[PDB]
Design an enzyme around this catalytic site. Structure first.
Site, PDB file in Angstrom:
ATOM      1  N   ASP A 205      -6.252  -1.066   2.714  1.00 50.26           N
ATOM      2  CA  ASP A 205      -5.334  -1.691   3.644  1.00 50.26           C
ATOM      3  C   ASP A 205      -4.836  -3.029   3.098  1.00 50.26           C
ATOM      4  OD1 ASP A 205      -5.694   0.340   5.487  1.00 50.26           O
ATOM      5  OD2 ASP A 205      -6.515  -0.950   7.070  1.00 50.26           O
ATOM      6  N   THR A 206      -3.576  -3.142   2.701  1.00 51.59           N
ATOM      7  CA  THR A 206      -3.056  -4.436   2.277  1.00 51.59           C
ATOM      8  C   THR A 206      -2.302  -5.065   3.449  1.00 51.59           C
ATOM      9  OG1 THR A 206      -1.033  -3.479   1.373  1.00 51.59           O
ATOM     10  CG2 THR A 206      -2.764  -3.955  -0.184  1.00 51.59           C
TER      11      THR A 206
ATOM     12  N   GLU B 278       0.531  -6.583   5.762  1.00 51.40           N
ATOM     13  CA  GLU B 278       1.835  -6.063   6.098  1.00 51.40           C
ATOM     14  C   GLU B 278       2.957  -7.032   5.752  1.00 51.40           C
ATOM     15  OE1 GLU B 278       2.341  -2.430   7.552  1.00 51.40           O
ATOM     16  OE2 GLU B 278       0.995  -3.293   6.040  1.00 51.40           O
TER      17      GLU B 278
ATOM     18  N   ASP C  49       0.821  -1.219   0.000  1.00 56.10           N
ATOM     19  CA  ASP C  49       0.000   0.000   0.000  1.00 56.10           C
ATOM     20  C   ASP C  49       0.851   1.263   0.000  1.00 56.10           C
ATOM     21  OD1 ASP C  49      -1.054  -0.133   3.561  1.00 56.10           O
ATOM     22  OD2 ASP C  49       0.897   0.238   2.649  1.00 56.10           O
TER      23      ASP C  49
ATOM     24  N   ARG D 132       0.931   6.839   0.062  1.00 55.82           N
ATOM     25  CA  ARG D 132       0.095   5.833   0.694  1.00 55.82           C
ATOM     26  C   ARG D 132      -1.182   5.711  -0.136  1.00 55.82           C
ATOM     27  NH1 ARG D 132      -2.970   2.469   2.441  1.00 55.82           N
ATOM     28  NH2 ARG D 132      -3.180   1.784   4.621  1.00 55.82           N
TER      29      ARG D 132
ATOM     30  N   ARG E  83       3.139  11.379   4.170  1.00 57.26           N
ATOM     31  CA  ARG E  83       2.922  10.643   2.926  1.00 57.26           C
ATOM     32  C   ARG E  83       1.809  11.265   2.101  1.00 57.26           C
ATOM     33  NH1 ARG E  83       2.213   4.692   5.231  1.00 57.26           N
ATOM     34  NH2 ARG E  83       0.627   5.795   6.476  1.00 57.26           N
TER      35      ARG E  83
END
Length: 135
Positions: free
Chosen positions: A34-35, A37, A15, A29, A81
């Site tokens: 949400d991918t 981790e 992400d 970002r 970001r």
């Protein structure tokens, strides 16, 4: 909303990516997703983390044109970001991640939510096909 051109520098995570944007290196970002981790030592490498990162990397590395789309709200987060929708040859990476079941539709904060419905529609499809995260 309008797109702007960017040039890849390095993909860091599913992400998070580093791009050259208006002559300056910048960490971006991906908005609304949400991918899993690969980084954070909170746990380590979550499942489908390496897969989500490879997808983002590949899609960006094999592209002719990259473009960043800012939403209507603030354009950077508290870590500095850029917050955007990233497009690879006209295709939104954010959506593709979700459609492939490699990302969840994140907690949405107005007014940075313009492509929300589109993405939740794509996440419902991926849930139906039981892809990756959803299997």
């Amino acid at each position: 909303l309008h797109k702007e051109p960017a040039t890849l520098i390095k993909a860091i995570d599913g992400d998070t990516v580093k791009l050259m944007y208006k002559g300056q290196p910048m960490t971006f970002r991906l908005l609304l997703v949400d991918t899993p981790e690969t980084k954070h030592p909170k746990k380590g490498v979550e499942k489908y983390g390496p897969e989500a990162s490879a997808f983002t990397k590949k899609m960006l590395e094999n592209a002719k044109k990259i473009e960043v789309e800012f939403d209507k709200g603030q354009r950077t987060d508290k870590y500095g970001r850029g917050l955007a929708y990233i497009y690879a040859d006209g295709k939104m990476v954010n959506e593709a991640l979700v459609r492939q079941g490699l990302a969840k539709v994140a907690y949405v904060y107005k007014p940075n939510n313009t492509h929300e419905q589109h993405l939740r529609k794509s996440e419902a499809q991926a849930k139906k096909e039981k892809l990756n995260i959803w299997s």
